[PDB]
Short mmCIF file of C-alpha atoms and ligand atoms in Angstrom, two decimals:
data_model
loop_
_atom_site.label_atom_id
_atom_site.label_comp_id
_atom_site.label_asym_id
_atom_site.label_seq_id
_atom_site.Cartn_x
_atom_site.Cartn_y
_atom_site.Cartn_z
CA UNK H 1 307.82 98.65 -16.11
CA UNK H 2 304.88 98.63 -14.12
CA UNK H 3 305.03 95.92 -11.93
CA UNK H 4 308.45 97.10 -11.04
CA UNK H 5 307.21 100.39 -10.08
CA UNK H 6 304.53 98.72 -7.85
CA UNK H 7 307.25 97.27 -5.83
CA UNK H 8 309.32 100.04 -5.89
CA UNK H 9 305.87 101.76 -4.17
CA UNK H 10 305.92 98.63 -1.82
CA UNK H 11 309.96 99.27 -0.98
CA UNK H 12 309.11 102.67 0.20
CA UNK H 13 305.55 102.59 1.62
CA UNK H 14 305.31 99.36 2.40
CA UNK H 15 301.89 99.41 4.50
CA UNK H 16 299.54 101.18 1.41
CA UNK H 17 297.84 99.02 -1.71
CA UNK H 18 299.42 99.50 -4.74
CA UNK H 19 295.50 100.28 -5.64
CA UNK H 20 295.41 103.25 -2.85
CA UNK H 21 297.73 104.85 -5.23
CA UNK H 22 296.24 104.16 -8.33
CA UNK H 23 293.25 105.98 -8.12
CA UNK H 24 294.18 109.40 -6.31
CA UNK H 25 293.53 112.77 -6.82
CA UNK H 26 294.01 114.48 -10.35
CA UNK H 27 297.28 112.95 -11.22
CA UNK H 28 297.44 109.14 -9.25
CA UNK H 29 297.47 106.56 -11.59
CA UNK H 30 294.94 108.24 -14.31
CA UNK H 31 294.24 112.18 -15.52
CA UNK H 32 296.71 114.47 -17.34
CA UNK H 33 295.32 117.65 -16.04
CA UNK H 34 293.69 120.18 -13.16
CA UNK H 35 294.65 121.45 -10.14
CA UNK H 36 296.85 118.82 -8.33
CA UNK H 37 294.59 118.15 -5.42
CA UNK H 38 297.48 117.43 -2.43
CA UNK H 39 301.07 117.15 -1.97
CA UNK H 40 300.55 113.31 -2.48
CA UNK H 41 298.50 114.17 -6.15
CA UNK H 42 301.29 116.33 -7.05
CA UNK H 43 303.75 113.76 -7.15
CA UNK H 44 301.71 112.06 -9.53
CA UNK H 45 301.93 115.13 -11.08
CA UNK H 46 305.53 115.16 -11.65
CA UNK H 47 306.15 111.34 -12.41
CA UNK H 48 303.52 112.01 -15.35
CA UNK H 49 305.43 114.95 -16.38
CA UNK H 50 309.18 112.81 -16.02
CA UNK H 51 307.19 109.90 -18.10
CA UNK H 52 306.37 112.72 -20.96
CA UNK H 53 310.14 113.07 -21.26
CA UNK H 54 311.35 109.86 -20.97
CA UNK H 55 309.30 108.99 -24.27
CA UNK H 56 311.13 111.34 -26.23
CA UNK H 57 313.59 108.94 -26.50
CA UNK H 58 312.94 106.74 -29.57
CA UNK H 59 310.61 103.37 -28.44
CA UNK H 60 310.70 104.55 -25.05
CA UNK H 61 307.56 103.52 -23.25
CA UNK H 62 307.66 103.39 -19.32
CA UNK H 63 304.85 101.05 -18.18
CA UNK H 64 306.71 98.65 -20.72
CA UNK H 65 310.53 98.97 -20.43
CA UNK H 66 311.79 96.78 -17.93
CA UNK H 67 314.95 98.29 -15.56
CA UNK H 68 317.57 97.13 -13.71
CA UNK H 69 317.31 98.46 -9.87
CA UNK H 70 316.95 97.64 -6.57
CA UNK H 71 315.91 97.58 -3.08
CA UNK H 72 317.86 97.02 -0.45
CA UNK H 73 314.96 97.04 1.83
CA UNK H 74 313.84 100.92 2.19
CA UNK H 75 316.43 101.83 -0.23
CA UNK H 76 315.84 102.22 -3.88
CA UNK H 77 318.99 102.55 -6.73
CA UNK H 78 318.96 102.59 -10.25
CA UNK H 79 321.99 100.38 -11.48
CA UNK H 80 324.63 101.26 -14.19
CA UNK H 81 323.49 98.90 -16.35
CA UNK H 82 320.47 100.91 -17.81
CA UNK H 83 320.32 101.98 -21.39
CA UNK H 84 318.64 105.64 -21.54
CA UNK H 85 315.30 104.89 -21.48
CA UNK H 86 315.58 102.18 -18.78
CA UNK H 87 317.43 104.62 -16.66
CA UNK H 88 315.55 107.38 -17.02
CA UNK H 89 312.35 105.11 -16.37
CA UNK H 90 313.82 103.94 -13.47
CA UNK H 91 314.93 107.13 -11.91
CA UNK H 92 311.32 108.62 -12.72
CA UNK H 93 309.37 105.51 -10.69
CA UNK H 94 312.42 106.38 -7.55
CA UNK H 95 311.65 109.79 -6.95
CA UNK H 96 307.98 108.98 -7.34
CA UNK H 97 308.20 105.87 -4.67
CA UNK H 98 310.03 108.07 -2.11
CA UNK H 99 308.04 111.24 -2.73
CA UNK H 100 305.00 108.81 -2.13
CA UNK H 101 306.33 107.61 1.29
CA UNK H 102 306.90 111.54 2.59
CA UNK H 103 303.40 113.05 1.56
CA UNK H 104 300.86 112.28 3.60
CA UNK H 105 297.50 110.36 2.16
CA UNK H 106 294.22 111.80 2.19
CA UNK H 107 291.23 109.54 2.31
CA UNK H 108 288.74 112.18 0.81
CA UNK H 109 291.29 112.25 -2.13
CA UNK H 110 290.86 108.36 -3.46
CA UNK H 111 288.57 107.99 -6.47
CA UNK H 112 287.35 111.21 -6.73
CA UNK H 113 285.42 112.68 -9.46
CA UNK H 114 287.61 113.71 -12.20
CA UNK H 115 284.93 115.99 -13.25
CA UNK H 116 284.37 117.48 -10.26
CA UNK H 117 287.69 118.15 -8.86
CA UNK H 118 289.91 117.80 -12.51
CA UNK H 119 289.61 121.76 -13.45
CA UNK I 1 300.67 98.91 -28.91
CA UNK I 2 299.44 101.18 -26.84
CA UNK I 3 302.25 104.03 -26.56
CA UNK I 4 301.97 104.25 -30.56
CA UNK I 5 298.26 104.64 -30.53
CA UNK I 6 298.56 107.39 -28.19
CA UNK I 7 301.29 109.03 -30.27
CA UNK I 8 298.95 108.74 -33.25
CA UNK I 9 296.51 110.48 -31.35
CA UNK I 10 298.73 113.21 -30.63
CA UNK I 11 299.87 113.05 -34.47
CA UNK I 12 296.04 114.41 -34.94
CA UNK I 13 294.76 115.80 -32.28
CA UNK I 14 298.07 117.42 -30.98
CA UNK I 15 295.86 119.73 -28.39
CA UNK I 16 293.89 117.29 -26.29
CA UNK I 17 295.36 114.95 -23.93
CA UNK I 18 295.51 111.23 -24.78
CA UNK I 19 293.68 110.70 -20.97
CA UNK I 20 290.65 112.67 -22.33
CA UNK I 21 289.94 110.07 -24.67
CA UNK I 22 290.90 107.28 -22.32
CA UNK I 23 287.98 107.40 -20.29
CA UNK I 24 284.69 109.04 -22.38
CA UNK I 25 281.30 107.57 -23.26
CA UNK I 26 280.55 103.92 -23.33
CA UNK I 27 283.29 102.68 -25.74
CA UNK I 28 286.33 105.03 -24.99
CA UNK I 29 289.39 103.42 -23.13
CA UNK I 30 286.64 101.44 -21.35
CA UNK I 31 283.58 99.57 -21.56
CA UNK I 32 282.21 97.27 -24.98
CA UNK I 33 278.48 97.87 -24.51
CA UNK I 34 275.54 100.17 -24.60
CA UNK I 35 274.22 102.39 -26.68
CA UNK I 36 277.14 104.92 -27.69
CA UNK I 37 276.89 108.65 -26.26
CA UNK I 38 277.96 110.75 -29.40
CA UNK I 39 279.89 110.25 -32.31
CA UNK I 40 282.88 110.84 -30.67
CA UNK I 41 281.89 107.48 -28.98
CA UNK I 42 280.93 106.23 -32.06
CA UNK I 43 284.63 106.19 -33.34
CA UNK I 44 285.58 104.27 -30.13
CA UNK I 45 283.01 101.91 -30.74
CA UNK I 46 284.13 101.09 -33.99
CA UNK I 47 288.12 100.77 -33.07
CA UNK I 48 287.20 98.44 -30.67
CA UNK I 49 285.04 96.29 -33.05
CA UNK I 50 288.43 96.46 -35.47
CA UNK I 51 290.26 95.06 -32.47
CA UNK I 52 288.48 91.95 -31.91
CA UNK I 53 288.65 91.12 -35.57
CA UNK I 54 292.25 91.90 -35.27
CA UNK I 55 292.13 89.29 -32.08
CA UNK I 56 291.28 86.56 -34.46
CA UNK I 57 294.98 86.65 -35.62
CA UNK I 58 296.73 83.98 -33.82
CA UNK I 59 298.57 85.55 -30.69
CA UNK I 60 297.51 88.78 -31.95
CA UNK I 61 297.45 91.45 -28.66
CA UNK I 62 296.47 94.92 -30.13
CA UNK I 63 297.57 96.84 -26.78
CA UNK I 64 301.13 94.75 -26.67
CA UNK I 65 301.71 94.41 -30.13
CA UNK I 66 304.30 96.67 -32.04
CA UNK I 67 303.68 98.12 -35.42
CA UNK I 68 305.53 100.46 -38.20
CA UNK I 69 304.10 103.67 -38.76
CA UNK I 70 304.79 107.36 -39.16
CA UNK I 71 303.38 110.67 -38.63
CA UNK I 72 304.39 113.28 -41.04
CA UNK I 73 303.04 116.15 -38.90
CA UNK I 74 299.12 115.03 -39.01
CA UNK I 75 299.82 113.00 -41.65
CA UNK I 76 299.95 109.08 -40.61
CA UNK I 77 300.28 105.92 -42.41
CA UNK I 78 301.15 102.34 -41.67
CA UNK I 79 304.18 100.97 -43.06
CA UNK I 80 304.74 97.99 -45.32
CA UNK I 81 306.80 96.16 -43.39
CA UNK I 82 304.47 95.23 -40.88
CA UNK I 83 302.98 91.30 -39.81
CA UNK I 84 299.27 90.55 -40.44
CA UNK I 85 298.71 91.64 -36.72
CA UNK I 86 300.72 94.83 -36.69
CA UNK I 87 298.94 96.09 -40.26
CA UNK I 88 295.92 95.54 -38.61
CA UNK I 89 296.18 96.83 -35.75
CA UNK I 90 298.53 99.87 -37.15
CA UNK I 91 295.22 99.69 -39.31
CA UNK I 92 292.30 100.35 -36.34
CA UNK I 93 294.35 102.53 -34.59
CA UNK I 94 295.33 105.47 -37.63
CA UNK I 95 290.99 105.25 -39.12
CA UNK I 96 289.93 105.80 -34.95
CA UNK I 97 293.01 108.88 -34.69
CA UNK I 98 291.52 110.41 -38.00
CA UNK I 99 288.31 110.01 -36.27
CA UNK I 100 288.73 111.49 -33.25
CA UNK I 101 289.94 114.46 -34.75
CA UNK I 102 286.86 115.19 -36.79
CA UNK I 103 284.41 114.46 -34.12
CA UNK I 104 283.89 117.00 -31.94
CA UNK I 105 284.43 116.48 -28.19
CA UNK I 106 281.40 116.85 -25.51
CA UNK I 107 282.70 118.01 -22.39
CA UNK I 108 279.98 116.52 -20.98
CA UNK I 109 280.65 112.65 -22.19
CA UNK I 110 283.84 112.07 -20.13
CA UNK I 111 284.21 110.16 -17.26
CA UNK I 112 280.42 109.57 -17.55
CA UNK I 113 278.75 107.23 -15.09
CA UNK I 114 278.39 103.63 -16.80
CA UNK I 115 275.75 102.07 -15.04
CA UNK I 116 273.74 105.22 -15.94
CA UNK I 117 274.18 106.01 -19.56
CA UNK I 118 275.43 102.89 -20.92
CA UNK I 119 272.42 100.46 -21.39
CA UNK K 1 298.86 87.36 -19.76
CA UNK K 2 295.88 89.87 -19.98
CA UNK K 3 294.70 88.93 -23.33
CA UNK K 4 294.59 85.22 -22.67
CA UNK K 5 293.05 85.42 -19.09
CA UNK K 6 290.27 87.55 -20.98
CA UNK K 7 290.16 84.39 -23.21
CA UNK K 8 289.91 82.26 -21.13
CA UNK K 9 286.87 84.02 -19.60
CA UNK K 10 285.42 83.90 -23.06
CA UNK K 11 285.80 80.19 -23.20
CA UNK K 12 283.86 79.44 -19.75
CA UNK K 13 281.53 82.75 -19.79
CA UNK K 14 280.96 83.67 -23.75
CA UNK K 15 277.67 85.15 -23.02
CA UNK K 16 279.33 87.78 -20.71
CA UNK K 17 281.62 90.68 -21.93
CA UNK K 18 285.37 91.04 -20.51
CA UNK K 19 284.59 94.36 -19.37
CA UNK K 20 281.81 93.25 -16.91
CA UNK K 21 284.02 91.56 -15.26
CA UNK K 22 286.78 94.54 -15.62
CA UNK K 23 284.92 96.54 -13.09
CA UNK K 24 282.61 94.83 -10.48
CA UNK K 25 282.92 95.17 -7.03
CA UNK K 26 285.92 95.85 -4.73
CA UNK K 27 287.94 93.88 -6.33
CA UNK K 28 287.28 92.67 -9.91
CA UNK K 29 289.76 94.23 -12.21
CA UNK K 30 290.98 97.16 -9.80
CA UNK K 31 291.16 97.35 -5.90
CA UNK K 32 292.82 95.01 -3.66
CA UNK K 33 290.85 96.11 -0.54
CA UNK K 34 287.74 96.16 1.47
CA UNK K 35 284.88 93.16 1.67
CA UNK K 36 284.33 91.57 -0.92
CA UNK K 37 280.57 92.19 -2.24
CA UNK K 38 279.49 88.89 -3.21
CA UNK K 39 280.52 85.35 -4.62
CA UNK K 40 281.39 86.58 -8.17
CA UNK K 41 283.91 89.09 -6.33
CA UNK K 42 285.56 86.62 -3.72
CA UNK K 43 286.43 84.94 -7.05
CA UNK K 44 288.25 88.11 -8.13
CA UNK K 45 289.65 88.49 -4.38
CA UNK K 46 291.29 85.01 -4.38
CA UNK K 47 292.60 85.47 -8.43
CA UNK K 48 294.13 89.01 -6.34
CA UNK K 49 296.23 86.94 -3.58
CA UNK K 50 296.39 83.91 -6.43
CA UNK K 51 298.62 86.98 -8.64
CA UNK K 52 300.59 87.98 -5.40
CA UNK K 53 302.13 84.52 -4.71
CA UNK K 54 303.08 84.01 -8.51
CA UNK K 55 304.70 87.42 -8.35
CA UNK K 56 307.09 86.16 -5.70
CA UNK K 57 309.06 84.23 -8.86
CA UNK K 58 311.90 86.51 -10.03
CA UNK K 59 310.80 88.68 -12.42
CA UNK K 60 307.05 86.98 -13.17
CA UNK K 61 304.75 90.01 -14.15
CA UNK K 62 301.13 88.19 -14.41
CA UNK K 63 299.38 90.47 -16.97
CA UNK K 64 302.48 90.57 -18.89
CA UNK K 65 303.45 86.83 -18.78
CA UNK K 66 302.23 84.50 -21.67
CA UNK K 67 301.36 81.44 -21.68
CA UNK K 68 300.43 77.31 -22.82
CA UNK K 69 297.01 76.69 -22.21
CA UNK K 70 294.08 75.76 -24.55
CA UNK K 71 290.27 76.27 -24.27
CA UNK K 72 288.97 72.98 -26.03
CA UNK K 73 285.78 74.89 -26.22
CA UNK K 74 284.54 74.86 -22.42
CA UNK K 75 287.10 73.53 -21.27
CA UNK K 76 290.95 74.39 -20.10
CA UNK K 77 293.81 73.77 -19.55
CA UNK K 78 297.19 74.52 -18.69
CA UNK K 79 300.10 72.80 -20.93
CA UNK K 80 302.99 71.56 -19.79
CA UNK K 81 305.35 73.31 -21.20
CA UNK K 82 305.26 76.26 -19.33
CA UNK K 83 307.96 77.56 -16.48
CA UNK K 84 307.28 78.60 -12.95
CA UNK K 85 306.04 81.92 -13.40
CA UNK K 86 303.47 80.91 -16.69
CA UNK K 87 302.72 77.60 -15.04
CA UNK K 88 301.61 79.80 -11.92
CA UNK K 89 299.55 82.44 -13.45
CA UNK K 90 298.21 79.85 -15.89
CA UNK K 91 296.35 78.43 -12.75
CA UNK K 92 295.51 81.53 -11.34
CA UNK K 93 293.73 82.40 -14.52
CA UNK K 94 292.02 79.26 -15.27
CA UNK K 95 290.51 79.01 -11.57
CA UNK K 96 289.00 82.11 -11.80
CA UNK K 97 287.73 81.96 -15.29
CA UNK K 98 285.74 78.87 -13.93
CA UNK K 99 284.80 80.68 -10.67
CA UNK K 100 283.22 83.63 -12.75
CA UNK K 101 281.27 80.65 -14.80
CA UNK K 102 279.54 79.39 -11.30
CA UNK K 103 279.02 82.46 -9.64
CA UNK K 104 275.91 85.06 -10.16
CA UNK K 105 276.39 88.32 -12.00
CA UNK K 106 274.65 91.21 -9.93
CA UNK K 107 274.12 93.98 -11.82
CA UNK K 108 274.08 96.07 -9.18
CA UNK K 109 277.38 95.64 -7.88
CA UNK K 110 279.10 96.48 -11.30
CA UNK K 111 281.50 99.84 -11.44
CA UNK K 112 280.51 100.77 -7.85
CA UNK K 113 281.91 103.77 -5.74
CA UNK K 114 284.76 102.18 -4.31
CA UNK K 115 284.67 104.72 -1.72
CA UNK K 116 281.11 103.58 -0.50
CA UNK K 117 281.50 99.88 -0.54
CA UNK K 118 285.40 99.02 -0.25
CA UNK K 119 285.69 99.81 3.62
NA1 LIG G 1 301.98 121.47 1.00
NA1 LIG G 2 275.99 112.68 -35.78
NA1 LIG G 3 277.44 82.75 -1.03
#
């Protein structure tokens, strides 16, 4: 669920806002299409695109479904209790946290102008 | 709740993305004031009206609240086995899908500057 | 949880609509960052760190939690029979909805360029 991907985000990058991701590029936290602006904006790009297939799966809906994971301070698992859309969630928001912490964050790219930079 | 809205959107207007309705005009995915933009607005203004009445139902949460519905490939209805909130709010959210698929779309309305055109 | 905070606000502030205070300054409704532009936005900054202490109960998710309280028209209050985490974000609510009642709305400071006026 949301709030458990926020502190995923705070596991891995624990110095940024939840907000300074929120509101990013094409991709961060709002926006379904464009030109990924950055490494950082694409991905956003890809956690949309692993959210789009996690809610194939009957009543799957990520921001909702809670998950069963954890952080061992840095490190981020998904546990073996998960149904399929809890484990799928999860594993989307994981890759997403730790892609987050490797791509570096551009200042000119927070709350841009979708209609200027969005294709 | 919100997931099945935007899968009723997609039920009708299976070519545009759910996020450009989510932020367009003075009524759509944001705002409750002003004068609206276009008709496309117009729809949003009136699906947001039919959620406040639906508020009026005790512990009633149109974005949270579960419904039964189905989309028979454009085709949508709202089951019977639904609460007095989820019929109404299964209700507001098939009439504003139907609605956004007539109205035609005004590249020009989205992510629009609020302070600006909205009163 | 969301719904009943943006109750709440109705019961102190009914003049006012939930979405001016959804997106006003640096930190009412989105943002957790920056100087806060005025009174009515230190109210939102404090309901900000108010949300982060509640969210250090296991598993309490503010916008999702609900709630006891009642608005005895004007007035609130918190019931008793909530837990830890709803007992918490109860207050948090309830403080703020009463802030927002005291403090000045400046028109001017409502959906602002976060990138101009949030440091
Ligand atoms: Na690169
Ligand atoms: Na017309
Ligand atoms: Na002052």
């Amino acid at each position: 669920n949301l709030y458990q991907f926020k502190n995923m985000i705070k596991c891995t990058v624990p110095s940024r806002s939840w907000w300074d991701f929120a509101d990013y590029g094409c991709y961060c936290g709002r926006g379904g299409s464009g030109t990924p602006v950055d490494d950082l904006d694409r991905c956003c790009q890809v956690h949309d695109n692993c959210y789009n297939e996690a809610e194939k799966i009957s009543g799957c809906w990520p921001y909702f479904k809670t998950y069963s994971y954890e952080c061992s301070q840095g490190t981020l698992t998904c546990k073996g209790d998960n149904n399929a859309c809890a484990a799928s969630v999860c594993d989307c928001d994981r890759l997403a946290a730790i892609c987050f912490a490797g791509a570096p964050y551009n200042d000119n790219n927070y709350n841009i102008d979708l209609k200027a930079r969005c294709q």
